[PDB]
Amino acid sequence: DPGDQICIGYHANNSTEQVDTIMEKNVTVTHAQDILEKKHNGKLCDLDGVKPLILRDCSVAGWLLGNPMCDEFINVPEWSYIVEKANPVNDLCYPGDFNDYEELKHLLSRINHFEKIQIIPKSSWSSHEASLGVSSACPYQGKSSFFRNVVWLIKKDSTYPTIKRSYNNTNQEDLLVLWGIHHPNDAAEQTKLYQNPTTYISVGTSTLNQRLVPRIATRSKVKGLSGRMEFFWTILKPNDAINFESNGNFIAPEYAYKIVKKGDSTIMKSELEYGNCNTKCQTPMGAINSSMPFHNIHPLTIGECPKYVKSNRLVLAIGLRNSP
Amino acid sequence: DPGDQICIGYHANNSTEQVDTIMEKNVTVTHAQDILEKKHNGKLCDLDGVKPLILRDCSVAGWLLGNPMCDEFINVPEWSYIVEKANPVNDLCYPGDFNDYEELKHLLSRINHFEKIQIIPKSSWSSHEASLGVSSACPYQGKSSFFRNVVWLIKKDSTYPTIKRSYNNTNQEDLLVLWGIHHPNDAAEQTKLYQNPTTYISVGTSTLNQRLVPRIATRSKVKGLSGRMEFFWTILKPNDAINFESNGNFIAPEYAYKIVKKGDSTIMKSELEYGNCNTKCQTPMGAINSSMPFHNIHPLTIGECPKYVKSNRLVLAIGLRNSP
Amino acid sequence: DPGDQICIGYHANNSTEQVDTIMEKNVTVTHAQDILEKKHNGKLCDLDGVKPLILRDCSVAGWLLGNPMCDEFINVPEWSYIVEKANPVNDLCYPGDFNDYEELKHLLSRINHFEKIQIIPKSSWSSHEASLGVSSACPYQGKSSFFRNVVWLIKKDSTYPTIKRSYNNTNQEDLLVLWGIHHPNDAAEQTKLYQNPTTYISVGTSTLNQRLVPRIATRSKVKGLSGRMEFFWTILKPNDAINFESNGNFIAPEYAYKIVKKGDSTIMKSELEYGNCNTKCQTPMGAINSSMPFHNIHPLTIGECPKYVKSNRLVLAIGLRNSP
Amino acid sequence: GLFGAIAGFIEGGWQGMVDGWYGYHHSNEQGSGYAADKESTQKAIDGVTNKVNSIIDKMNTQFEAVGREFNNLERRIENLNKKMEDGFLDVWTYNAELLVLMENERTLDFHDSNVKNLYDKVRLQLRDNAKELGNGCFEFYHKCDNECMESVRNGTYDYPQYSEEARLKREEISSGR
Amino acid sequence: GLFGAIAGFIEGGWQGMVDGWYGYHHSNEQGSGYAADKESTQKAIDGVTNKVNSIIDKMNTQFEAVGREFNNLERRIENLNKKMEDGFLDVWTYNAELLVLMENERTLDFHDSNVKNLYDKVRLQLRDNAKELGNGCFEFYHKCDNECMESVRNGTYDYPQYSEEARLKREEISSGR
Amino acid sequence: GLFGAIAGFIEGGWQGMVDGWYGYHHSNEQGSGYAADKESTQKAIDGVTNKVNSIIDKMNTQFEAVGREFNNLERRIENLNKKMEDGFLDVWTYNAELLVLMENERTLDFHDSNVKNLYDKVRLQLRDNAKELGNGCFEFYHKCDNECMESVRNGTYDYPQYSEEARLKREEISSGR
Numbered sequence A, B, C: 001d002p003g004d005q006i007c008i009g010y011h012a013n014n015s016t017e018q019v020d021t022i023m024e025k026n027v028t029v030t031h032a033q034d035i036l037e038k039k040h041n042g043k044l045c046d047l048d049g050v051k052p053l054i055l056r057d058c059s060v061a062g063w064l065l066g067n068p069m070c071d072e073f074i075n076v077p078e079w080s081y082i083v084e085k086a087n088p089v090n091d092l093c094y095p096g097d098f099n100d101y102e103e104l105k106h107l108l109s110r111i112n113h114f115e116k117i118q119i120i121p122k123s124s125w126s127s128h129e130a131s132l133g134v135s136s137a138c139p140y141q142g143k144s145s146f147f148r149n150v151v152w153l154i155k156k157d158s159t160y161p162t163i164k165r166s167y168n169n170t171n172q173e174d175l176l177v178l179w180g181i182h183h184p185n186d187a188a189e190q191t192k193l194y195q196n197p198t199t200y201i202s203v204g205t206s207t208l209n210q211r212l213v214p215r216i217a218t219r220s221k222v223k224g225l226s227g228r229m230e231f232f233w234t235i236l237k238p239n240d241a242i243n244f245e246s247n248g249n250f251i252a253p254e255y256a257y258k259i260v261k262k263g264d265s266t267i268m269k270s271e272l273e274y275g276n277c278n279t280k281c282q283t284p285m286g287a288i289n290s291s292m293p294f295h296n297i298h299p300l301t302i303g304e305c306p307k308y309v310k311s312n313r314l315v316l317a318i319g320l321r322n323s324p
Numbered sequence D, E, F: 001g002l003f004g005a006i007a008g009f010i011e012g013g014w015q016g017m018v019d020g021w022y023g024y025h026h027s028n029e030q031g032s033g034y035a036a037d038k039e040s041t042q043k044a045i046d047g048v049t050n051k052v053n054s055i056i057d058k059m060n061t062q063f064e065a066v067g068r069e070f071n072n073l074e075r076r077i078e079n080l081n082k083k084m085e086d087g088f089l090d091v092w093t094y095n096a097e098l099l100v101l102m103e104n105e106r107t108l109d110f111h112d113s114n115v116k117n118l119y120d121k122v123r124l125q126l127r128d129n130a131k132e133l134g135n136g137c138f139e140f141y142h143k144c145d146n147e148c149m150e151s152v153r154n155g156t157y158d159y160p161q162y163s164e165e166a167r168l169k170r171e172e173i174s175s176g177r
């Protein structure tokens, strides 16, 4: 005969979730909680509302200078973030250098919209030749061409009279202005294009005080050319003025960019393309839609995102140890 | 019948100190210990014995070159740390540039005292005009004037004969030397001020090898002026000599600075003024007087200070859990 | 009368190992484990198979340019890591400068072997004097001399005809190439050495476009000399060509270096010399031979090594507490 | 575990207790059944939810990597840049992995301590009115119906009330009959 | 807590024990009173003061910010510079706060462990010479004066000495009159 | 320690048990001796070995300092470079030193928890067939040979089997003789 009884015990079930501990691995428990997000959609999406500027085979340089092969991006709408490939094919179509180029790429990460404006009209070049500035290194479509936002001026008749051109920024927003100098291959070519043998480019701002001088040298062929192009940039503050003076080898501006909207942004390196989707967290490898507090997709994300970690596994133990 | 008794119990009291724990927040305990100092006195004080260099409305640049409006700091006494406002008003009174300026400010964070010494007498300029180098951009008090430590040389009669001057650092300490060049607006002004149209400033050391050339350009007006001044600096090692040769556009030194005591220091950004107090821990927001191991005032401290963290609260549990 | 008994107890022994814990220091226990390695062998060793490059008193500059006193390293074998003293004695024997020198040192950390090649034969300078390029600041052994991998050309008879020289890299690996320019003391000396008073050095690559000009200045004597030499470098890509042109003041190449093997490497700063030993872990203080997971020798180690920490003691507790 | 209850003197957990982590299994004359302890179950849930939230919250702000680009003769700072972003990514992975690991242990020994502290809240209510069997169950020396079991569950159990019947049942088993 | 002593089987602490953290409350023929256990109180003080010092001492050196200035075309390294100084300050804040939370718990379960260990040192001295009430108090089966209570406190308590008087009082209660 | 066994009710350890950490000391008619518990000793070894590997292994990746050189006008970033590499070494040193200190404590209270849990496995096998001495030893109320001690060690011990002999020996001490 059994006298009345009472027992104390604990929960168990059919759960085979496993957790880990400093002293013990793979311990099976009642309840667990995963905190690591591991899945993405392999696609580039809009961020909340907004579509990213996806340069395809274009570089930041190609777009802003206006490489002919970059005509897709002649007047871009506002972006959330820029996507650029690792080695864009259409950079500086005519071989050369973009000065302080990285620092320019930096300003772009807090810029969300530009507005292209003409500050020296191509029609205005009455005593020089605006339309002979064309290269085989810069092909539009078989027709050989040039960068669109800038102008490769050349001598008229036999002469190249001194240029004095100026633009006063009467806008309220900052202006990104681009220009350049051309470095010929020998004195013979120099005097053929520009007449005058000893030349310069001076550029005046309330802050700039520049005088560039073309630099003759014998060089290896790049894309069939030995000459080179070297580009330069500035920010023109509101109510300030930029003043050009030159005498040869001047690659003059036509269009500049007004900085119209600033904000969170980034230049994202990725080979992917537009995914026609939308998320609140984007990664160079795909977008994330998740409640997890942690992910291990890629450290460079933009938007309302989980915190990045490198783990393969992060699971918390919540319930109690489940029966052997 | 009460049999004899013995009981085991624990302390309790009238303390309402609350701590937090991983599983429970605001747990009331017997004894607690705050380790975070949160109070400062909002003043800029001496640091132990020594009074800080407080530039009121001057910058490091305005002080060192001797902006006429900065006469307060003409002969500063030894200091403990420098304090500079975020956007000082009296900087380079004549518009232009201070070369490698940050890297110079970097050195100041370990300099505690200078001694201004005259290395090229203003009176010595016998065949040039020392006393005409004066600008309306550089006002003393309505009298238009100029930087005090450098001299703006000008042609005398009609000519500007080639300058050759040199100073041999016969001190046992390092010399901070300053000088500069002027960029006029046109060919006209160049020949008006200096006669000679094609000019240079050469500067020589055991390590320096510089040849500056004035850079004519059309620029926006700054303070009513279109000209520019561009200043340079070097550390002249003991028993070394520096050599100047120039020919126009030379803004020559009179005084330089011997680095006389080095040590810990910093340049602190702050809007404050002198506080007429004294401490052993100073912060751009005010001084700290505390025994606590932690504070949350400001990350940039100089002196014997608690370690900074970003918390609002850090309290350790000492006693035991206090009665419900 | 004692009834039968059973007791439960624990291990103890003759151990005086002490560990620490958060609440208690120096707690003596049964078994402990040290995990901190504290010993090294005070010598610089081979790293697995390979001998380190030990410059004795040379700097990296001295080696590559070919300082006469640096003849030990005229054709060094493949290395595992380079060791350099804190302030090498045999640097640039002729006073001057090595441009972007640190950026070059950085490249060295991924290079294990060069192969010196002749790209412009000292014999070919048919209309200039290759053999007068010699200085008292550059002594061999009393015989004054010059850097060996480059050649200081001087005017022949009374003239200095314009140089045009070039090399096309037909090798399959990259080429480190060096050259330099000479800064005279005055106009008088300029024409004595080179005849032409106004001179230049141009260098062209698929990516370079340089035009250097000598910089006359009155300067302090260094090693009894007032003039200066300034040296430059570039990497010449396979199938690319370099073209020199000058007119005076040119310090022309003879030899350049082909990068033949890349891999892990470092430039280790140390005063030590060759240890005639061998490791799997090397340190600027001595080699480490250990199973320990941690060491506290020096943070800069190369090879299969323990992780560095600054601690003086790291011991884990393994057994249980040893009797009071 | 540290406290010797779970997977201890209580071999096995009860598949049948489906409304709590910890509980009771009574067995008197009227029959048997399962009943979960509400206060200790609730005491642990609040403890675990505060733990989960303390962990997610501590990693709220944590280093966030940013894209920076450097050219070809900026190799030095480029490398400084990389080791930095890598460095912090390494720190914060270690902080995360280790925190889960350490607090995973402390979570399991909490459930253990909770069961054993529940076992002893019962042990010190009954005392000599019942016999501790050693498997985590108690055998009464008196009769205890359903309203008495309830007094045990919620802590109402009256000792002087049953101590008389118990001390007489003890006498009955000491003698032998 | 974890050990079921503080706010456990000992519900409530004694407002009247003003000379220690842990202690006793005796009650015999002569009267009653409080007596704090001085060495266990002293042994916990030594542990907690070492804990406070361990925490302050591990933060000996920790990142110290330095002021650095940059120009308009040095934006890249300027940005690099902020993320790092920010980076480390976030690490040391995370570490400070996290160590305080963790060792706060281990402190409270330390005091808990100290009570439950004090209750059982007395319990295994007395054994069956006193009856466990379960409320953290003991009821003796023999007479114990002030020189006898003191023998329990400092650990002097003699079991065979009182075992005769006690085993006869156990039997008087077996009979129950 | 935390659980009151080591340096608790078991004052002192047995110099004589050279084949394990925790164990038994039998004492019957045939004589006495030391015998180590095979199962509990192994349970701690696996735990300590996994901790030792867990600690080394988490320091898998950690900041590795690298050489960088800077010129005379790169003074600022020279300083940035230095405070960074320094910074990370301070972090990883602190992360390491602190982890051992913390896992040193938990290690000692693991062994403590293990002894006290072996004592209770036996106490809850025997119950009233033996008398609890309080020094960690049990005195049987019955006769127990070497195959009986073994039944206790490996957990085979039969309670109803000896319960009659023990309950008669309990009554003899009730009478006085």
Ligand SMILES: *[C@@H]1O[C@H](CO)[C@@H](O[C@@H]2O[C@H](CO)[C@@H](O[C@@H]3O[C@H](CO)[C@@H](O)[C@H](O)[C@@H]3O)[C@H](O)[C@H]2NC(C)=O)[C@H](O)[C@H]1NC(C)=O
Pocket: A168, A169, A170, A239, A240, A241, B220, B221
């Ligand atoms: C670019 O064009 C802008 C167009 O607005 C010009 O800015 C204007 O300049 C005039 C003087 O030429 C300023 O007028 C002055 O106002 C001040 C008080 O603020 C007074 O002291 C003067 O007597 C004068 O009346 C006017 O402020 C300014 N406009 C704005 C919107 O600020 C400017 O001339 C051109 N910029 C350059 C660099 O050439």
Ligand SMILES: *[C@@H]1O[C@H](CO)[C@@H](O[C@@H]2O[C@H](CO)[C@@H](O[C@@H]3O[C@H](CO)[C@@H](O)[C@H](O)[C@@H]3O)[C@H](O)[C@H]2NC(C)=O)[C@H](O)[C@H]1NC(C)=O
Pocket: B168, B169, B170, B239, B240, B241, C220, C221
């Ligand atoms: C600038 O002034 C310093 C200090 O007055 C001068 O340096 C001194 O120069 C003389 C030569 O005119 C040195 O004398 C020499 O001593 C060496 C041994 O050190 C000896 O071998 C020579 O035969 C010669 O007589 C003197 O030592 C030196 N003093 C110091 C302290 O260095 C010099 O006039 C100027 N220095 C420069 C770099 O222009």
Ligand SMILES: *[C@@H]1O[C@H](CO)[C@@H](O[C@@H]2O[C@H](CO)[C@@H](O[C@@H]3O[C@H](CO)[C@@H](O)[C@H](O)[C@@H]3O)[C@H](O)[C@H]2NC(C)=O)[C@H](O)[C@H]1NC(C)=O
Pocket: A220, A221, C168, C169, C170, C239, C240, C241
């Ligand atoms: C440096 O020397 C290299 C090594 O010979 C030269 O590279 C070669 O350049 C020639 C042109 O002179 C290339 O010939 C071409 O062949 C391709 C087919 O392979 C064809 O597309 C063209 O119609 C042309 O005939 C040759 O491919 C190329 N070799 C390699 C391996 O790429 C080069 O000329 C020299 N560089 C300079 C700047 O002079």
Ligand SMILES: *[C@@H]1O[C@H](CO)[C@@H](O[C@@H]2O[C@H](CO)[C@@H](O)[C@H](O)[C@H]2NC(C)=O)[C@H](O)[C@H]1NC(C)=O
Pocket: A025, A026
């Ligand atoms: C932990 O459990 C897992 C699950 O079986 C094991 O980890 C590995 O899991 C993969 C599948 O993802 C299987 O190939 C093996 O089961 C495991 N691989 C290896 C290489 O071991 C593992 O067995 C358990 N870990 C430990 C330490 O016991």
Ligand SMILES: *[C@@H]1O[C@H](CO)[C@@H](O[C@@H]2O[C@H](CO)[C@@H](O)[C@H](O)[C@H]2NC(C)=O)[C@H](O)[C@H]1NC(C)=O
Pocket: B025, B026
């Ligand atoms: C911690 O205790 C305080 C006691 O008031 C609480 O802290 C917060 O502060 C405001 C005003 O000081 C209180 O009215 C609120 O209760 C708290 N604010 C918020 C936004 O929660 C708080 O109640 C306690 N903490 C927790 C987690 O309950």
Ligand SMILES: *[C@@H]1O[C@H](CO)[C@@H](O[C@@H]2O[C@H](CO)[C@@H](O)[C@H](O)[C@H]2NC(C)=O)[C@H](O)[C@H]1NC(C)=O
Pocket: C025, C026
């Ligand atoms: C830890 O034990 C050692 C035992 O020597 C002590 O640490 C130091 O070492 C010297 C001998 O080398 C001792 O005499 C000193 O006590 C210590 N030196 C210094 C400079 O303090 C120490 O006694 C113990 N540590 C603590 C905190 O008690």
